[PDB]
Design a protein around this motif. Structure first.
Motif, PDB file in Angstrom:
ATOM      1  N   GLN A 130       0.826  -1.204   0.000  1.00  0.00           N
ATOM      2  CA  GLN A 130       0.000   0.000   0.000  1.00  0.00           C
ATOM      3  C   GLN A 130       0.861   1.255   0.000  1.00  0.00           C
ATOM      4  O   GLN A 130       0.525   2.248  -0.657  1.00  0.00           O
ATOM      5  CB  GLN A 130      -0.939  -0.011   1.207  1.00  0.00           C
ATOM      6  CG  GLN A 130      -1.924   1.152   1.243  1.00  0.00           C
ATOM      7  CD  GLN A 130      -2.859   1.087   2.432  1.00  0.00           C
ATOM      8  OE1 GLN A 130      -2.755   0.191   3.273  1.00  0.00           O
ATOM      9  NE2 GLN A 130      -3.785   2.038   2.511  1.00  0.00           N
ATOM     10  N   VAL A 190      -8.094  -7.574   1.204  1.00  0.00           N
ATOM     11  CA  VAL A 190      -8.451  -6.802   0.018  1.00  0.00           C
ATOM     12  C   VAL A 190      -9.883  -6.287   0.128  1.00  0.00           C
ATOM     13  O   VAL A 190     -10.170  -5.132  -0.213  1.00  0.00           O
ATOM     14  CB  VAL A 190      -8.224  -7.643  -1.255  1.00  0.00           C
ATOM     15  CG1 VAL A 190      -8.797  -6.962  -2.490  1.00  0.00           C
ATOM     16  CG2 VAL A 190      -6.739  -7.882  -1.467  1.00  0.00           C
ATOM     17  N   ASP A 191     -10.788  -7.105   0.669  1.00  0.00           N
ATOM     18  CA  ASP A 191     -12.153  -6.647   0.890  1.00  0.00           C
ATOM     19  C   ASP A 191     -12.278  -5.645   2.036  1.00  0.00           C
ATOM     20  O   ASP A 191     -13.329  -5.006   2.152  1.00  0.00           O
ATOM     21  CB  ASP A 191     -13.067  -7.846   1.153  1.00  0.00           C
ATOM     22  CG  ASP A 191     -13.269  -8.701  -0.080  1.00  0.00           C
ATOM     23  OD1 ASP A 191     -13.208  -8.156  -1.201  1.00  0.00           O
ATOM     24  OD2 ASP A 191     -13.489  -9.923   0.072  1.00  0.00           O
ATOM     25  N   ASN A 192     -11.255  -5.481   2.872  1.00  0.00           N
ATOM     26  CA  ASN A 192     -11.283  -4.521   3.972  1.00  0.00           C
ATOM     27  C   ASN A 192     -10.089  -3.574   3.901  1.00  0.00           C
ATOM     28  O   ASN A 192      -9.389  -3.340   4.889  1.00  0.00           O
ATOM     29  CB  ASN A 192     -11.326  -5.243   5.317  1.00  0.00           C
ATOM     30  CG  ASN A 192     -12.660  -5.912   5.575  1.00  0.00           C
ATOM     31  OD1 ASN A 192     -13.717  -5.344   5.292  1.00  0.00           O
ATOM     32  ND2 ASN A 192     -12.621  -7.122   6.118  1.00  0.00           N
ATOM     33  N   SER A 193      -9.837  -3.012   2.719  1.00  0.00           N
ATOM     34  CA  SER A 193      -8.802  -2.003   2.547  1.00  0.00           C
ATOM     35  C   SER A 193      -9.261  -0.967   1.532  1.00  0.00           C
ATOM     36  O   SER A 193      -9.964  -1.297   0.572  1.00  0.00           O
ATOM     37  CB  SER A 193      -7.476  -2.615   2.086  1.00  0.00           C
ATOM     38  OG  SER A 193      -7.596  -3.166   0.787  1.00  0.00           O
ATOM     39  N   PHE A 194      -8.839   0.283   1.738  1.00  0.00           N
ATOM     40  CA  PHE A 194      -9.251   1.409   0.901  1.00  0.00           C
ATOM     41  C   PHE A 194      -8.594   1.421  -0.476  1.00  0.00           C
ATOM     42  O   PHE A 194      -8.879   2.331  -1.261  1.00  0.00           O
ATOM     43  CB  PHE A 194      -8.947   2.731   1.612  1.00  0.00           C
ATOM     44  CG  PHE A 194      -9.860   3.034   2.770  1.00  0.00           C
ATOM     45  CD1 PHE A 194     -11.065   2.365   2.925  1.00  0.00           C
ATOM     46  CD2 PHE A 194      -9.510   3.998   3.701  1.00  0.00           C
ATOM     47  CE1 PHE A 194     -11.904   2.648   3.991  1.00  0.00           C
ATOM     48  CE2 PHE A 194     -10.343   4.290   4.769  1.00  0.00           C
ATOM     49  CZ  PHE A 194     -11.540   3.612   4.913  1.00  0.00           C
ATOM     50  N   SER A 231      -8.580  -4.191  13.450  1.00  0.00           N
ATOM     51  CA  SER A 231      -8.200  -5.197  12.454  1.00  0.00           C
ATOM     52  C   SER A 231      -8.297  -4.757  10.991  1.00  0.00           C
ATOM     53  O   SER A 231      -8.149  -5.598  10.096  1.00  0.00           O
ATOM     54  CB  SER A 231      -9.031  -6.474  12.647  1.00  0.00           C
ATOM     55  OG  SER A 231      -8.755  -7.082  13.898  1.00  0.00           O
ATOM     56  N   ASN A 232      -8.522  -3.457  10.750  1.00  0.00           N
ATOM     57  CA  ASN A 232      -8.572  -2.831   9.419  1.00  0.00           C
ATOM     58  C   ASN A 232      -9.608  -3.508   8.511  1.00  0.00           C
ATOM     59  O   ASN A 232      -9.283  -4.102   7.479  1.00  0.00           O
ATOM     60  CB  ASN A 232      -7.181  -2.812   8.769  1.00  0.00           C
ATOM     61  CG  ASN A 232      -7.085  -1.834   7.609  1.00  0.00           C
ATOM     62  OD1 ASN A 232      -8.045  -1.137   7.282  1.00  0.00           O
ATOM     63  ND2 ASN A 232      -5.914  -1.776   6.983  1.00  0.00           N
ATOM     64  N   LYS A 233     -10.871  -3.409   8.914  1.00  0.00           N
ATOM     65  CA  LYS A 233     -11.971  -4.065   8.222  1.00  0.00           C
ATOM     66  C   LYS A 233     -13.006  -3.037   7.782  1.00  0.00           C
ATOM     67  O   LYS A 233     -13.341  -2.116   8.531  1.00  0.00           O
ATOM     68  CB  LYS A 233     -12.621  -5.123   9.115  1.00  0.00           C
ATOM     69  N   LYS A 234     -13.500  -3.195   6.557  1.00  0.00           N
ATOM     70  CA  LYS A 234     -14.599  -2.373   6.075  1.00  0.00           C
ATOM     71  C   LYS A 234     -15.916  -2.798   6.713  1.00  0.00           C
ATOM     72  O   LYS A 234     -16.203  -3.991   6.846  1.00  0.00           O
ATOM     73  CB  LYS A 234     -14.715  -2.480   4.559  1.00  0.00           C
ATOM     74  CG  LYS A 234     -13.604  -1.818   3.786  1.00  0.00           C
ATOM     75  CD  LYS A 234     -13.848  -2.012   2.307  1.00  0.00           C
ATOM     76  CE  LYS A 234     -12.829  -1.283   1.469  1.00  0.00           C
ATOM     77  NZ  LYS A 234     -13.066  -1.478   0.011  1.00  0.00           N
ATOM     78  N   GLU A 235     -16.721  -1.812   7.106  1.00  0.00           N
ATOM     79  CA  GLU A 235     -18.077  -2.058   7.575  1.00  0.00           C
ATOM     80  C   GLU A 235     -19.011  -0.990   7.028  1.00  0.00           C
ATOM     81  O   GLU A 235     -18.584   0.105   6.652  1.00  0.00           O
ATOM     82  CB  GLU A 235     -18.127  -2.084   9.104  1.00  0.00           C
ATOM     83  N   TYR A 281     -22.771  -4.622  -4.229  1.00  0.00           N
ATOM     84  CA  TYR A 281     -23.015  -5.373  -3.003  1.00  0.00           C
ATOM     85  C   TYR A 281     -24.426  -5.929  -2.910  1.00  0.00           C
ATOM     86  O   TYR A 281     -24.606  -7.058  -2.448  1.00  0.00           O
ATOM     87  CB  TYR A 281     -22.721  -4.491  -1.785  1.00  0.00           C
ATOM     88  CG  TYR A 281     -21.248  -4.204  -1.582  1.00  0.00           C
ATOM     89  CD1 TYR A 281     -20.274  -5.004  -2.176  1.00  0.00           C
ATOM     90  CD2 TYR A 281     -20.828  -3.125  -0.811  1.00  0.00           C
ATOM     91  CE1 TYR A 281     -18.928  -4.744  -1.999  1.00  0.00           C
ATOM     92  CE2 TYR A 281     -19.481  -2.859  -0.628  1.00  0.00           C
ATOM     93  CZ  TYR A 281     -18.537  -3.672  -1.225  1.00  0.00           C
ATOM     94  OH  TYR A 281     -17.198  -3.412  -1.048  1.00  0.00           O
ATOM     95  N   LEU A 298      -6.831   9.611   6.306  1.00  0.00           N
ATOM     96  CA  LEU A 298      -7.906   8.629   6.376  1.00  0.00           C
ATOM     97  C   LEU A 298      -7.583   7.371   5.582  1.00  0.00           C
ATOM     98  O   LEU A 298      -7.997   6.273   5.972  1.00  0.00           O
ATOM     99  CB  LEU A 298      -9.211   9.243   5.866  1.00  0.00           C
ATOM    100  CG  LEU A 298      -9.784  10.402   6.684  1.00  0.00           C
ATOM    101  CD1 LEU A 298     -10.997  10.998   5.986  1.00  0.00           C
ATOM    102  CD2 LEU A 298     -10.140   9.947   8.089  1.00  0.00           C
ATOM    103  N   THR A 299      -6.848   7.506   4.475  1.00  0.00           N
ATOM    104  CA  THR A 299      -6.558   6.385   3.595  1.00  0.00           C
ATOM    105  C   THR A 299      -5.100   5.951   3.603  1.00  0.00           C
ATOM    106  O   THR A 299      -4.830   4.780   3.314  1.00  0.00           O
ATOM    107  CB  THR A 299      -6.954   6.726   2.150  1.00  0.00           C
ATOM    108  OG1 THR A 299      -6.170   7.833   1.688  1.00  0.00           O
ATOM    109  CG2 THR A 299      -8.426   7.095   2.077  1.00  0.00           C
ATOM    110  N   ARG A 359     -13.942   2.433   7.860  1.00  0.00           N
ATOM    111  CA  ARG A 359     -13.050   1.553   8.603  1.00  0.00           C
ATOM    112  C   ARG A 359     -13.553   1.364  10.028  1.00  0.00           C
ATOM    113  O   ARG A 359     -13.752   2.339  10.757  1.00  0.00           O
ATOM    114  CB  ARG A 359     -11.642   2.146   8.636  1.00  0.00           C
ATOM    115  CG  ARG A 359     -10.929   2.250   7.303  1.00  0.00           C
ATOM    116  CD  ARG A 359      -9.550   2.863   7.507  1.00  0.00           C
ATOM    117  NE  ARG A 359      -8.846   3.099   6.252  1.00  0.00           N
ATOM    118  CZ  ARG A 359      -8.042   2.217   5.670  1.00  0.00           C
ATOM    119  NH1 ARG A 359      -7.833   1.035   6.231  1.00  0.00           N
ATOM    120  NH2 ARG A 359      -7.442   2.520   4.527  1.00  0.00           N
TER     121      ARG A 359
END
Lengths: 499, 658
Positions: A130, A158-162, B469-473, B502, A386-387, B465
């Motif tokens: 990143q 990958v599904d939880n990163s900007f 654990s750096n997870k999208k929600e 989604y 933020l990113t 975020r």
């Protein structure tokens, strides 16, 4: 309390410094009877493990076992985990095979390791990817075990990163490669960054096939974990000079400091558990013959002398000490970067090329580009907090900002840039399709000769520390004498501002 | 010229059978000068000194294969682990024969462990064969054993990779508790009835008792268990008509020993035909050098293909499991085990016996019953969702409009204020308006009940975020929808490309653009092309709703980062806050949808919209994934489009002016 530290070592590490590790340590002694038993073992068989556990557990009820290993056997930690499951004694693994990463523990076992798991290592490696905008990559997974968890962790990350990672599909293996069906999957690869999860003897054949298929180019990257990178002495010649590895093997912190920190964690857990419950020392009497208050879920909250040595739910450290190394041209694992609590430090923020991986690689495609901070041309802003990523139209660059005037040492702070000349350079990279090396100058303004010494961008280009000046620059006689300008594109003269 | 075989075996009759199989192994292999010796050890009730005795006896014996063949052990640990670990120190294959734990499947932990029995996750593939027969898509997973739970989830995702469907509910928790009936009722409120269980006997009996007390074993409830769940008190607590599995010769040890002897003997006679022969040293005293042909002999064992045995085609995969396994499918008919199916390595065939179900007929119960009461969540839209407090106690004052139309309200439930303002105040009040009448039209077209509640905040929902654990929600209406607490978002949903990835979208009912709310020298702005709004200052105060989709649409715009940096200092909670702030002449511009501000301009003449019309988009109904509530509902929406019911809704609020 009674803690036994047994060490199996080949290097001449004596025992009396462990006897001196009892006196000044634990100055504020909350247990009234703290004793240590320092022992050294020459053999590495599990028979000696069972024998010394039956000796020291019956040896006046020792409640603490500390072991370090010098060999390359990961089964010794599994044997000590079984011993901790049977004897219900908190056992710590320090170095070598005692600190090699295992997958899943048990609630019956209270064994713990001072290491860095593959999940946090994958987090650090994706943090590296990143921080470099290396978003187009691939993934090659062999039949080395523990691989589906690695793929699933990459998918969730990958599904939880900007970023929105441009990930090529996973090249899978079944056996040792026939170079018939795996050849088609390897010829699908056209991306730069290549990730791999295998063993060393598999990686020799993988790198031999990659050199045979030409996957070791200057554009193509290779990032490997610490489990495939074994001994520092045993380096075969088939490794590409520039191989990125991440291992927690820190030579600055010796084994004595690590076992001192482990004794600090043990005494911290004992002193904090003695304040809650009274009858804390409870062990097994002897091995021959046919627990409620445990330290298994108690020392998650621990901090020794300011060092964040807290423990995870899986039994590993929350914030370990990862070390990012590469392979130099002298065929050595060169120590490069260290890791902070959660953020990543980089001693070499300038990413090196290592463009000649082999001898016969004639490649001259990179271009060194420097510019100057002007407001309508090169808008220079901070990175987004933020990113932690420059947006699509902005590009990263570095700036060597000094700390003071007392020292000449500074830091290469990475910032984002946009504007006119950034768009010009991006469209030049779209048309010509080259690779650029963008950075900033720290000498000063455009250019001025002081006794045959130029400064700024003129001093960078004329003295050949760069290639070309894409940014804004006025044109006069002596500048056209020292270098060769291109054709003019914008009509920018001079003017006078009044009310 | 000798080959030693170590074994941990108890009974003298099976020791004699093992020695007889060793003696008969050299029968058809000619008069070659190889010899076969066997060494079997008993069992002390402990486990440390057992591991010590076995490991030093097999070091002193220098064996090649190590076998553990003890099913009926009183200890429920079932751990031949330390002998396998000691052999993995020198990379010697231990052939486990009894246990089926998934911790042995990890070859990174068990470096030199082989086995001829698969784990129970392969039975899920057999259950996927149920999906190949009974055509069932939505499942309900319940796994207590977390050591095999991640492997079961991995195998389930591997099976669902083909159809590209999703499991509706997965559950992992600590074995030993008893109050898991809340999640059972949450799974009962779902559409599916497929129950997949993976635990020990105690948790299986606990959930059998929990289903028996709450009557979750009635009609249509799909039950599908294995061999561990039909033993002990779980067999006593099992309801009649449950379908289970049976391992053919799973506990029959006598033929299994002969099969293992044949496998080991043909592996040794295969290894004798090649070069680089190494031997295990005396590793007890002064020998830490590893056996160099560990992975070589493992590679010999990888390509081991056999044709002898009562069981059949024993064959190893890349995990060293069992290929082509005959399984049985049993039914519990009035506390009696009745066989209802057989299974070869690829196909299920039911026998001549019938399949009697716990519900109604003998055919398959379609346990996919759609929700007749669709949980409706919405946001307080000012011209569309009118929320009124109750008069006396939970009642709605049936007031009449000026056009002779009675307002058909609904009893909705909503919080009072924000979370720092109101800690916990959620009351039922009266919801009515535009989309409420749309839902009345939907309930008039198709017969279905509903449940209108409100979202807890005043936000649409953004991709943020989470702080660990750096997870999208997601949050807001999307966060309440994806959590399963909501069913259908009836709201003016801003259709974009991110949310289309989604969830699935319906046809838009509203079609409008964007505009600027000002109050009435250039009093107008004429859209985004004002150069003073490109480089703003402290004078032109313009912002939007916090965590709105308009901010996401501007975030996609990579050439208006200045407005994104400017509007973040003045984002409000709701749009009515912006209306009140510009009413006090504190704001200066506000990007918002067209017809809402047109209706507010009809209400208040000082509210002035701008002239341009950009982002000409549509608003539809927030929906779930692939579902039977999509096509008929979209046809009902298009039926509302084709007639004058859109003009009727215009006569209610849009065409009506003052």
């Amino acid at each position: 309390l009674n803690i036994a530290v047994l060490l199996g070592h080949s290097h001449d590490v004596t025992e009396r410094e462990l006897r001196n590790l009892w006196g000044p340590e634990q100055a504020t002694g909350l247990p009234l009877d703290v004793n240590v038993v320092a022992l050294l073992m020459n053999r590495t068989d599990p028979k000696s493990l069972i024998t010394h556990v039956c000796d020291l557990m019956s040896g006046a009820r020792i409640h603490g076992l500390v072991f370090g290993d010098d060999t390359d056997q990961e089964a010794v930690a599994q044997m000590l985990d079984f011993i901790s499951s049977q004897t219900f004694i908190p056992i710590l693994g320090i170095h070598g095979g005692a600190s090699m990463i295992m997958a899943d523990k048990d609630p019956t076992s209270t064994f713990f390791q001072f290491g860095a798991s593959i999940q946090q290592q994958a987090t650090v490696m994706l943090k590296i990817m990143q921080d470099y905008d290396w978003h187009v990559f691939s993934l090659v997974t062999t039949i080395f075990p523990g691989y589906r968890d690695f793929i699933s962790f990459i998918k969730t990350t990958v599904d939880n990163s900007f970023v929105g990672w441009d990930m090529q599909n996973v090249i899978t293996l079944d056996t040792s490669f026939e170079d018939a069906k795996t050849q088609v999957q390897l010829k699908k690869i056209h991306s730069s960054v290549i990730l791999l999860y295998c063993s060393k003897d598999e990686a020799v054949l993988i790198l031999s096939e990659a050199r045979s298929l030409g996957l070791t180019g200057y554009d193509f990257f290779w990032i490997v974990p610490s489990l495939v990178s074994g001994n520092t002495e045993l380096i075969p010649k088939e490794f590409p000079s520039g191989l990125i590895s991440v291992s927690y093997d820190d030579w600055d912190y010796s084994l004595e400091a690590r076992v001192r920190d482990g004794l600090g964690i043990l005494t911290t857990a004992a002193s904090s558990m003695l304040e809650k419950f009274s009858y804390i020392p409870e062990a097994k009497a002897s091995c021959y013959g046919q627990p409620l208050h445990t330290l298994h879920q108690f020392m998650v909250n621990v901090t020794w002398d300011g060092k964040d040595l807290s423990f995870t739910e899986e039994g590993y450290q929350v914030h370990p000490r990862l070390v990012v190394i590469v392979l130099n041209k002298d065929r050595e694992w060169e120590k490069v970067g260290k890791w902070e609590n959660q953020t990543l430090s980089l001693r070499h923020a300038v990413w090196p090329r290592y463009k000649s991986f082999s001898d016969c690689e004639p490649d001259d495609n990179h271009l060194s580009i420097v510019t100057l901070e002007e407001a309508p041309f090169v808008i220079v802003e901070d990175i987004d907090p933020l990113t932690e990523t420059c947006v699509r139209n902005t590009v990263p660059c570095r700036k060597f900002v000094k700390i003071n005037n007392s020292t000449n040492e500074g830091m290469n702070v990475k910032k984002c840039c946009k504007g006119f000349c950034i768009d010009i350079l991006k469209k030049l990279s779209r048309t010509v399709k080259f690779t650029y090396d963008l950075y900033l100058v720290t000498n000063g303004k455009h250019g001025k000769k002081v006794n045959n010494v130029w400064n700024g961008m003129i001093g960078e280009v004329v003295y050949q520390r760069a290639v070309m000046a894409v940014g804004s620059l006025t044109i006069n006689e002596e500048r056209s004498e020292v270098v060769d300008f291109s054709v003019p594109f914008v009509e920018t003269g001079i003017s006078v501002m009044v009310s | 010229k000798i080959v030693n075989i170590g074994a941990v075996l108890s009974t003298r009759k099976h020791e004699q059978m093992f020695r007889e199989a060793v003696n008969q192994a050299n029968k058809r292999h000619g008069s070659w000068k190889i010899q076969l010796n066997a060494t079997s050890v008993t069992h002390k009730p402990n486990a440390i000194q057992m591991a010590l005795s076995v490991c030093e006896d097999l070091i002193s014996s220098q064996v090649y294969a190590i076998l553990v063949s003890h099913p009926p052990t009183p200890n429920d640990h079932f751990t031949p682990t330390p002998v396998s670990y000691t052999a993995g120190f020198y990379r010697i294959p231990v052939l486990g024969l009894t246990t089926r734990m998934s911790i042995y499947s990890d070859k990174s932990i068990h470096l030199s462990f082989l086995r001829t029995v698969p784990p129970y996750s392969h039975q899920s593939s057999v259950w996927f064969e149920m999906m190949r027969v009974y055509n069932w898509n939505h499942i309900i997973l319940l796994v207590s054993d977390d050591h095999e739970g991640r492997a079961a989830q991995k195998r389930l995702e591997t099976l669902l990779e083909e159809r590209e469907s999703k499991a509706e509910k997965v559950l992992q928790f600590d074995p030993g508790t008893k109050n898991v009936t809340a999640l059972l009722m949450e799974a009962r409120e779902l559409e599916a009835r497929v129950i997949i269980l993976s635990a020990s006997e105690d948790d299986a009996a606990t959930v059998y008792r929990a289903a028996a007390m709450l009557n979750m074993t009635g009609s249509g409830y799909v039950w599908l268990v294995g061999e561990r769940e039909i033993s002990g008190n779980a067999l006593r607590y099992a309801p009649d008509g449950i379908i289970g599995l049976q391992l053919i010769n799973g506990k029959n040890e006598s033929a299994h020993i002969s099969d293992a002897v044949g496998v080991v003997a043909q592996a040794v006679h295969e290894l004798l035909e090649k070069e680089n022969i190494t031997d295990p040293p005396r590793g007890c005293v002064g020998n830490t050098n590893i056996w160099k042909t560990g992975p070589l002999f493992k590679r010999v064992l990888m390509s081991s293909k056999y044709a002898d045995g009562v069981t059949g085609r024993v064959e190893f995969n890349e995990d060293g499991d069992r290929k082509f396994a005959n399984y049985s499918i049993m039914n519990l008919q009035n506390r009696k085990l009745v066989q209802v199916g057989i299974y070869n390595g690829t196909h299920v065939i039911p026998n001549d016996r019938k399949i009697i179900w716990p519900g109604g007929e003998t055919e398959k119960p379609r346990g996919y019953q759609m929700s007749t009461r669709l949980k409706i969540v919405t946001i307080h839209q000012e011209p569309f969702v009118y929320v009124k407090p109750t008069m006396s106690d939970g009642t709605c004052k049936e007031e009449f409009t000026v056009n002779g139309d009675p307002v058909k309200k609904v009893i909705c439930t909503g919080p009072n204020d924000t979370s720092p303002g109101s800690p916990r105040h959620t009351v039922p009040q009266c919801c009515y308006g535009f989309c409420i009448d749309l839902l009345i039209k939907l309930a008039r077209t198709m017969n279905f009940t509903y449940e209108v509640h409100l979202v807890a905040d005043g936000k649409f929902g953004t991709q943020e975020r989470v702080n660990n654990s750096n997870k999208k929600e997601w949050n807001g209406m999307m966060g309440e929808l994806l959590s399963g607490q909501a069913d259908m978002i009836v709201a003016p949903l801003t259709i974009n490309n991110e949310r289309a990835q989604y969830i699935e979208f319906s046809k838009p009912f509203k079609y409008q653009g964007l505009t600027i709310l000002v109050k009435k020298p250039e009093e107008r702005i004429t859209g985004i092309n004002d150069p003073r709004l490109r480089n703003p200052s402290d004078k032109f105060i313009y912002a939007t709703v916090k965590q709105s989709s308009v901010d996401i649409y501007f975030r996609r715009q990579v050439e208006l980062s200045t407005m994104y940096r400017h509007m973040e200092k003045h984002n409000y909670e709701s749009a009515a806050e912006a209306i009140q702030a510009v009413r006090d002449n504190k704001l200066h511009a506000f990007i918002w949808d067209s017809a809402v501000l047109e209706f507010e301009a009809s209400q208040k003449c000082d509210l002035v919209t701008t002239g341009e019309l950009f982002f000409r988009s549509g608003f539809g109904i927030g929906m779930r994934k692939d579902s039977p509530w999509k096509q008929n509902v979209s046809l009902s929406i298009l039926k509302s489009h084709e007639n004058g019911f859109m003009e009727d809704l215009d006569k209610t609020w849009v065409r009506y002016q003052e």
